[PDB]
Amino acid sequence: TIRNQRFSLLKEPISSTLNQHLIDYPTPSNLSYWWGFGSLAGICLVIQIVTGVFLAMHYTPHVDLAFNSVEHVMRDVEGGWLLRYMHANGASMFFIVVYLHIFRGLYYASYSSPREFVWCLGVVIFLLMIVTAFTGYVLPWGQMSFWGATVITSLASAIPVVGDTIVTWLWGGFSVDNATLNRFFSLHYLLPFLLVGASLLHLAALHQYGSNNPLGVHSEMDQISFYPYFYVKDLVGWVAFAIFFSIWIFYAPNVLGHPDNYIPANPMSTPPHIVPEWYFLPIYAILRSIPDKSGGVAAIALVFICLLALPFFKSMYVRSSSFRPIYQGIFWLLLADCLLLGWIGCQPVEAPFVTIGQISSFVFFLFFAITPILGRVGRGIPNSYTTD
Amino acid sequence: ADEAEHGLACPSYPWPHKGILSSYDHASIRRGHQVYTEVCASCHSMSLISYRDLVGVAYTEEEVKAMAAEIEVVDGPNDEGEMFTRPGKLSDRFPQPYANEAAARFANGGAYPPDLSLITKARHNGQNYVFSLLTGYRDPPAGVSIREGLHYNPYFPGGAIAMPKMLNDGAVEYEDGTPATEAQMGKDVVSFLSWAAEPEMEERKLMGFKWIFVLSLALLQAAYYRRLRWSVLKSRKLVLDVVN
Amino acid sequence: DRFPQPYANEAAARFANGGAYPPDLSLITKARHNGQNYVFSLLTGYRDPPA
Amino acid sequence: KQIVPVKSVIYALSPFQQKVMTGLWKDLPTKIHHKVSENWISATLLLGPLVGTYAYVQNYLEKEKLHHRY
Amino acid sequence: IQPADVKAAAMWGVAAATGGLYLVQVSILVLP
Amino acid sequence: PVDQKRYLEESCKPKCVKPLLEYQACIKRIHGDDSGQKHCTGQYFDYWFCVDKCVAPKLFTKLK
Amino acid sequence: GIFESLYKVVMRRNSVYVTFVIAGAFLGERAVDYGIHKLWEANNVGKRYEDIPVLGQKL
Amino acid sequence: FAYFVLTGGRFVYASLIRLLVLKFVLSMSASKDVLALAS
Ligand SMILES: CCCCCCCCCCCCCCCCCC(=O)OC[C@H](COP(=O)(O)OCCN)OC(=O)CCCCCCCCCCCCCCCCC
Ligand code: HEC
Numbered sequence: 012t013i014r015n016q017r018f019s020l021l022k023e024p025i026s027s028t029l030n031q032h033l034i035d036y037p038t039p040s041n042l043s044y045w046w047g048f049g050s051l052a053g054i055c056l057v058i059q060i061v062t063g064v065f066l067a068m069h070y071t072p073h074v075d076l077a078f079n080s081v082e083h084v085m086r087d088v089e090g091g092w093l094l095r096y097m098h099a100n101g102a103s104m105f106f107i108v109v110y111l112h113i114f115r116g117l118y119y120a121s122y123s124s125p126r127e128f129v130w131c132l133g134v135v136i137f138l139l140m141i142v143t144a145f146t147g148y149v150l151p152w153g154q155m156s157f158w159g160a161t162v163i164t165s166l167a168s169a170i171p172v173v174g175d176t177i178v179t180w181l182w183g184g185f186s187v188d189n190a191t192l193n194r195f196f197s198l199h200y201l202l203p204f205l206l207v208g209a210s211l212l213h214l215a216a217l218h219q220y221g222s223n224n225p226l227g228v229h230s231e232m233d234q235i236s237f238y239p240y241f242y243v244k245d246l247v248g249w250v251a252f253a254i255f256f257s258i259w260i261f262y263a264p265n266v267l268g269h270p271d272n273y274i275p276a277n278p279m280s281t282p283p284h285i286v287p288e289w290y291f292l293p294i295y296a297i298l299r300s301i302p303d304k305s306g307g308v309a310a311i312a313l314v315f316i317c318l319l320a321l322p323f324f325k326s327m328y329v330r331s332s333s334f335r336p337i338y339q340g341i342f343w344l345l346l347a348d349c350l351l352l353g354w355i356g357c358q359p360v361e362a363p364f365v366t367i368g369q370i371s372s373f374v375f376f377l378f379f380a381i382t383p384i385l386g387r388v389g390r391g392i393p394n395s396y397t398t399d
Numbered sequence: 400a401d402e403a404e405h406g407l408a409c410p411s412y413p414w415p416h417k418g419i420l421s422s423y424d425h426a427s428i429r430r431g432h433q434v435y436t437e438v439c440a441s442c443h444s445m446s447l448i449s450y451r452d453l454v455g456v457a458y459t460e461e462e463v464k465a466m467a468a469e470i471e472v473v474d475g476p477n478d479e480g481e482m483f484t485r486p487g488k489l490s491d492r493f494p495q496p497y498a499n500e501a502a503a504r505f506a507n508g509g510a511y512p513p514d515l516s517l518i519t520k521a522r523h524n525g526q527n528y529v530f531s532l533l534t535g536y537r538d539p540p541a542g543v544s545i546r547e548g549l550h551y552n553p554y555f556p557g558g559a560i561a562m563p564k565m566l567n568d569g570a571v572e573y574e575d576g577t578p579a580t581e582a583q584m585g586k587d588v589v590s591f592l593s594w595a596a597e598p599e600m601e602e603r604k605l606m607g608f609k610w611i612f613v614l615s616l617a618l619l620q621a622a623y624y625r626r627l628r629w630s631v632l633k634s635r636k637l638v639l640d641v642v643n
Numbered sequence: 644d645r646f647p648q649p650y651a652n653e654a655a656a657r658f659a660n661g662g663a664y665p666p667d668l669s670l671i672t673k674a675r676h677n678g679q680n681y682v683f684s685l686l687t688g689y690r691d692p693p694a
Numbered sequence: 695k696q697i698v699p700v701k702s703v704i705y706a707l708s709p710f711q712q713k714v715m716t717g718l719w720k721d722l723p724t725k726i727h728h729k730v731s732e733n734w735i736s737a738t739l740l741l742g743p744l745v746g747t748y749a750y751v752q753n754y755l756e757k758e759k760l761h762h763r764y
Numbered sequence: 765i766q767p768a769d770v771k772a773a774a775m776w777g778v779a780a781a782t783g784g785l786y787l788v789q790v791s792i793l794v795l796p
Numbered sequence: 797p798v799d800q801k802r803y804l805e806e807s808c809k810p811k812c813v814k815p816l817l818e819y820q821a822c823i824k825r826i827h828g829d830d831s832g833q834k835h836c837t838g839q840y841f842d843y844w845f846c847v848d849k850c851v852a853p854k855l856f857t858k859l860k
Numbered sequence: 861g862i863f864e865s866l867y868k869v870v871m872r873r874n875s876v877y878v879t880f881v882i883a884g885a886f887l888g889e890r891a892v893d894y895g896i897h898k899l900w901e902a903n904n905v906g907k908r909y910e911d912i913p914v915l916g917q918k919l
Numbered sequence: 920f921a922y923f924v925l926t927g928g929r930f931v932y933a934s935l936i937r938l939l940v941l942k943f944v945l946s947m948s949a950s951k952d953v954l955a956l957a958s
């Protein structure tokens with residue numbers, strides 16, 4: 012084939028890269044809907060960006076005007092309550108979808124070779140989402156907003172030699188005042204574009220090494236083009252997600268939040284129950300469970316170290332959980348542990364929740380510490396079960 | 400102890416504006432605004448609601464104009480730099496009873512009567528909590544004698560609240576002759592407060608119903624589309640030259 | 644604290660000065676073109692009008 | 695990223711000669727049976743710790759409150 | 765071929781105008 | 797202007813007299829004590845929780 | 861069949877198909893809005909703003 | 920039958936897209952307090 016005269020626009024250089032990577036990318040023929048969850052997370056990110064821009068057309072980053080500006084958006088702006096509820100509940104759905112993404116990856120062991128770079132870029136993406144959502148939640152400037160900012164920024168003092176200096180520098184002036192508000196608005200506006208860049212790199216690395224499948228096996232025998240076969244599957248996922256998200260926006264918009272964020276920030280009194288948003292609760296529970304706050308920060312760093320250390324395991328030959336009963340049970344126990352851990356974080360430090368959290372976090376790390384053992388034993392399996 | 404600290408739990412009352420197709424009782428909103436103006440505006444403030452917010456919701460435009468013309472507000476400098484007071488217009492927010500938080504606390508014994516604009520969204524189980532708080536001024540239990548200068552209220556965290564029992568039988572004279580009792584006054588004021596915290600509830604509910612229905616139909620279409628496009632693949636027969 | 648203000652508001656300043664507002668002098672040398680020379684000449688050049 | 699051929703023979707029918715929304719309803723009892731009999735263990739390991747911990751927590755809270763009730 | 769081409773262009777123009785009216789319903793312009 | 801809530805709670809007082817009896821038992825114990833912290837707000841909370849649960853729908857179906 | 865008839869009507873040129881899709885979107889949205897409005901008004905009788913007894917007696 | 924099912928879904932999608940676009944643009948449009956101060 013010499014391309015003398017042009018046949019198809021899709022194969023022209025203007026649409027050639029897009030053609031390959033969107034229409035013609037070969038995909039395993041047996042993918043279920045969790046790959047749809049990955050695409051759905053992308054859509055949630057785009058929704059957040061658009062609604063955030065149109066919200067920032069009305070938000071004043073000053074300490075004396077932020078709360079009343081948000082109430083302006085809700086009451087005066089034409090269809091502004093829709094924008095604000097979409098932004099908040101869209102942050103929530105973004106985190107829900109990313110959690111389902113991560114747990115599918117864990118179940119099917121997609122972190123294994125050769126997708127170590129994909130998993131690591133995913134971990135970086137998760138860090139960026141955490142930071143962006145936190146600094147954004149500081150913006151409305153309520154009781155929960157101000158006090159959560161105070162606590163989570165002041166736990167950065169646990170660094171041995173330069174903790175206090177970093178805390179003061181990040182605060183900008185001995186407290187979490189107007190300077191911190193402007194700082195957080197600028198950072199919240201900036202970070203989503205770095206998040207878009209990270210997502211693009213994530214997808215590029217995956218596209219380099221293909222895509223896993225529910226069997227975990229080599230899958231270059233039966234492969235089909237992405238369009239239209241997986242576009243329609245993703246479309247079904249998107250419409251179902253739209254119905255879910257519309258249930259949340261219109262009928263129960265304040266269920267996923269706390270009522271203390273509707274009181275203007277008053278640094279004098281302290282609300283009796285200071286907790287982050289529901290999607291930071293597992294991390295908050297781990298950190299609160301391990302005492303000696305320096306130990307808590309070290310434990311969070313250890314959580315991310317374990318997450319980054321999953322891909323680089325030794326044998327781990329069989330990949331999918333469909334052929335790993337022990338690992339299947341371990342994964343389900345880990346998921347139950349994560350849900351319980353998230354529930355613990357909303358409870359006070361009074362007993363027995365301290366014991367329950369100190370057990371749950373230990374079980375979390377135990378999952379992360381017993382996967383190589385299963386891999387080694389499984390590597391030992393084939394020379395024992397032979398039927399002859 | 401902990402029980403009194405977290406307060407007696409509030410029941411689940413059947414509010415008229417509860418349900419996927421349920422609107423505010425606008426007569427009750429009007430009645431609640433009356434009771435708030437009569438008894439609650441002496442200490443509490445709203446400061447987030449304009450008089451124009453009442454137009455088409457509980458009052459007619461001329462009525463709101465007259466009500467605004469009743470009160471007087473300070474307007475900016477004139478051609479001499481001095482300040483002056485003019486009757487309120489249809490855009491001014493509800494008047495504030497106290498100069499600032501310090502004056503409010505000084506007038507109310509150090510306790511600050513909270514702003515009531517978002518009161519039902521600033522408490523857990525907002526509307527039920529507010530109704531129960533207003534109605535449940537009960538005799539304190541045995542051997543729990545609270546200090547002078549407060550009142551016992553089981554729902555309030557700690558049991559001791561700073562405002563006195565305000566809603567009394569016959570406190571106000573309703574315009575439409577509705578018999579004023581404590582429960583009725585509480586219901587009306589909580590309906591008004593819940594409207595104030597969320598004036599978009601009806602439009603939001605209508606949009607939600609319409610779009611959930613429409614998107615459900617879209618979901619059926621998308622499922623059919625996916626099945627149709629995948630049916631040349633799922634109903635296929637392949638011969639592979641292998642057995643075991 | 645900052646430097647005090649001689650007048651409560653711009654309207655008060657205008658009423659005191661017969662409708663003229665004495666501009667803020669913080670950035671007067673950058674607000675006016677050729678600010679330094681302009682201000683010096685204006686302060687010192689109070690001459691007699693021509694015929 | 696090469697493609698490995700397998701030397702098969704595939705017959706396929708056009709999408710407009712097939713029933714499109716009937717396979718979802720053909721074998722509901724058998725499919726429900728298969729789901730339950732294949733995932734009951736995983737359901738126990740998921741919902742087991744949660745329900746057990748919940749029961750333990752409510753039990754202990756009841757004991758503690760009744761004990762501190764003067 | 766030209767009659768068919770201009771007919772198709774006019775049909776697409778009618779579709780575009782219908783989409784424009786749908787996006788921006790203007791009885792103010794429709795009435796006169 | 798008889799209070800509907802008070803009348804309804806008085807009417808439903810004999811519905812769940814068991815928490816009320818427990819509360820009275822604590823009242824007698826506290827009267828015997830007369831020296832301790834002697835609060836037992838738990839019985840109060842249980843009894844009034846039952847009454848409030850009773851008077852949930854009747855109040856609004858009686859209100860105008 | 862009715863499907864074949866309407867196909868022969870509005871499924872031979874794509875321009876007519878897109879115009880039909882837009883017109884159907886407008887008409888269907890209006891119909892659903894009218895139905896939901898009737899349902900809402902039926903369900904919330906008496907509670908409307910237009911029918912409160914003292915709407916114009918404060919003057 | 921397939922094309923008519925697809926057409927029903929398609930004008931559902933058209934309705935959704937118009938709704939979203941108009942919501943964004945009208946949000947960027949004027950405001951109630953400004954309209955009140957129009958005098
Ligand atoms: C109090 C302090 C101590 C607490 C812990 C003490 C107990 C430790 C564990 C004891 C039990 C270990 C059992 C290991 C052998 C499992 C045997 C096995 O694989 O059986 C096959 C079965 C297959 O299932 P299926 O296919 O449904 O069967 C139908 C067959 N035709 O397979 C299955 O049914 C799958 C079962 C998977 C179970 C996985 C979890 C238990 C084993 C590892 C425990 C690790 C604990 C720490 C980590 C927890 C997770 C973070
Ligand atoms: C002056 C006296 C009044 C009047 C006429 C009313 N309130 Fe009340 N209120 C007042 C104070 C000083 C306080 C603070 C008490 C404290 O928080 O320690 C309050 C408190 C409230 C609350 C908050 C309760 C809580 O946060 O748990 C509410 C919801 C409230 N007040 C409502 C309310 C209503 C509806 C009134 C009209 C009937 C009303 N107050 C009158 C002081 C005063």
Ligand code: HEM
Pocket residue numbers: 045046047048049050052053056109112113116121122126129130131132133134136137210213214217222223224
């Ligand atoms: C901004 C949020 C994210 C987006 C937009 C995103 C996007 C995607 C996309 C588009 C794919 C390819 C399609 C698919 O397989 O589902 C993918 C795959 C993948 N992602 Fe993500 N992702 C995100 C977050 C994460 C996170 C936090 C992780 C884990 C740390 C992760 C791990 C993976 C893995 C392992 C795959 C491989 C899929 C497979 O094995 O089949 N992603 N992601």
Ligand code: HEM
Pocket residue numbers: 056059060061062063064066067070081095098099101102103105140143144145147148149150151199200201203204
């Ligand atoms: C560049 C894109 C974005 C912009 C411009 C933006 C801007 C804003 C603004 C102005 C607010 C305050 C308005 C309000 O109070 O509702 C806000 C709130 C918030 N944003 Fe964003 N945002 C963006 C993207 C994101 C992303 C990607 C997330 C992560 C999910 C996020 C999470 C949040 C959260 C949690 C809040 C607080 C919700 C609340 O108001 O209660 N934002 N954002």
